[PDB]
């Protein structure tokens, strides 16, 4: 059950230093290497760095001067730190088990073969001048990402956190569609992301869809989640949306009741 869980702050002010922690489960840090990868909004994946079983660190060159990676075998954790953050450092951050290996393959000139030294095919003699040559090595650097974690979203901004305001989107008599009806919640004015919404404590999963959030001109985010329910059940079964905004340690359970028209 190899799992890798990220933990840290969802918001950081500019110039400061972001600090994150990766908690491992299932495997021993003394066995497999660990690295960190980030992806900015609508940007490609970017390599950060890695630490091996020998606690040796290797970083992305362009970011070496701002990166620091540490390990603790006992706690089974790996910590990452980024200095002098900017808005461009806003992104999603993942930690992952990685495979690294250098492969020292040698190449011989034309007409020769390895056998140690590069010897001419058909040479017959072991030390004949002109029947052997010095092999030149080519290092083949191996890298790939064994296993990924969930990912933590990190926002860099001078603005301050704000909790969400949850308003209902109830189905009226003129909004129904026969045996079916749409009802939801509006999660208004929050910052930063993320927000997650469930319905009836997850026991209602059929037909739920939570829309992406829009960023208004105020700098805040708004988001909506809706569920499709039998029109026969409106007025019998209760429907509650469970909003969660960890960036302000908030949880709101709003009851969406049918409009009485």
């Amino acid at each position: 059950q190899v799992q890798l869980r990220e933990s840290g702050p969802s918001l950081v002010k500019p110039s400061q230093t972001l600090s994150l922690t990766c908690t491992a489960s299932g495997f021993s840090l003394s066995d497999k290497a660990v690295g960190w990868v980030r992806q900015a909004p609508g940007k490609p994946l970017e390599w950060l760095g890695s630490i091996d079983t020998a606690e040796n660190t290797g970083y992305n060159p362009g970011l070496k001067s701002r990166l620091s990676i540490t390990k603790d075998n006992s706690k089974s954790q790996v910590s990452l730190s980024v200095s002098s953050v900017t808005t461009e450092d806003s992104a999603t951050y993942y930690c992952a088990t990685v495979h690294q290996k250098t492969r020292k393959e040698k190449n011989c000139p034309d007409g020769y073969i390895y056998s140690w030294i590069c010897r001419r095919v058909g040479s017959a003699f072991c030390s004949r001048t002109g029947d052997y040559t010095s092999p030149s090595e080519f290092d083949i650097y191996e890298f790939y990402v064994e296993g990924w974690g969930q990912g933590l979203l990190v926002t860099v901004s001078s603005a301050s956190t704000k909790g969400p305001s949850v308003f209902p989107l109830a189905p009226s008599s003129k909004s129904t569609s026969g045996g079916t009806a749409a009802l939801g919640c509006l999660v208004k004015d929050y910052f930063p992301e993320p927000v997650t919404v469930s319905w009836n404590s997850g026991a209602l999963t059929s037909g739920v869809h939570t829309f992406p959030a829009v960023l208004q001109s105020s700098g805040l985010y708004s988001l909506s989640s809706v569920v499709t329910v039998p029109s026969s059940s409106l007025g019998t079964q209760t429907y509650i949306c469970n909003v969660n905004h960890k960036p302000s340690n908030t949880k709101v359970d709003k009851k969406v009741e049918p409009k009485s028209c």
């Binding site: 690294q100 650097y141 191996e142 890298f143 869809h209 829309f211 909506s224």
Partner: protein, 214 residues
């Protein structure tokens, strides 16, 4: 950055291929990897060592390299293959990984569908808080190219409009949403507001009035 095609397209059941172009120092060194990013979930490890297939990956995914160019080929293209795809290769060190510019994969051939539109007016609670937000939810449509417009008393409205970009649902049909943010005075200075969704020449329009309950 490893050059990948910005976007490629394929049809259900067929075979498609994505390139990854680097240099002698990254792809030329070899050992290329391929990863799949499904919106919402965490990336997956698909291919390692140019060709090695990860555990649980079906044989339809295949990797190859020729010189400074790798290629991922997906046969029997399924609907769950709509995603972004990235390549990666070390460079001058097993700890300096270089990723590719990324490629978005689009799967075609799915049944078309017209958008079902629901328009909610400002909740009583939100009005009592001196705020008004009109929510227009657009569901279950294919292709995903829609256009929203807002009409305040038959006139077009562009201020206070914020529209999401369409996104696939769990049933693989697209959805989008648009919000009109108004002060309660604006909301009552008009008799009706209308959300117009244009999709395949067709236009589904919902209308709400503050005087009624809707």
């Amino acid at each position: 950055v490893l050059n990948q095609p910005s976007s490629v397209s394929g049809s259900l059941g067929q075979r498609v291929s994505i390139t990854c172009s680097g240099s002698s120092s990254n792809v030329g060194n070899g050992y290329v990897s391929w990863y799949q990013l499904i919106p919402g979930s965490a990336p997956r490890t698909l291919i390692y060592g140019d060709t090695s297939r990860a555990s649980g990956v079906p044989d339809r995914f295949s990797g190859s390299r020729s010189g400074n160019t790798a290629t991922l080929t997906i046969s029997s293209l399924q609907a769950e293959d709509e995603a972004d795809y990235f390549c990666a290769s070390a460079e001058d060190s097993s700890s300096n990984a270089v990723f590719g510019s990324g490629t978005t994969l689009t799967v075609l051939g799915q049944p078309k569908a017209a958008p079902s539109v629901t328009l909610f007016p400002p909740s009583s609670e939100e009005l009592q808080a001196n705020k008004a937000t009109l929510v227009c939810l657009i569901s279950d449509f294919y292709p995903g190219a829609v256009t929203v417009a807002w009409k305040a008393d038959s006139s077009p409205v562009k201020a206070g409009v914020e529209t999401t970009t369409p996104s696939k649902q769990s049933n693989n049909k697209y959805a989008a949403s648009s919000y009109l943010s108004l002060t309660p005075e604006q909301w009552k200075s008009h008799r009706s507001y209308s959300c117009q969704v244009t999709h395949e020449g067709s236009t589904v329009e919902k209308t709400v009035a503050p005087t009624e309950c809707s």
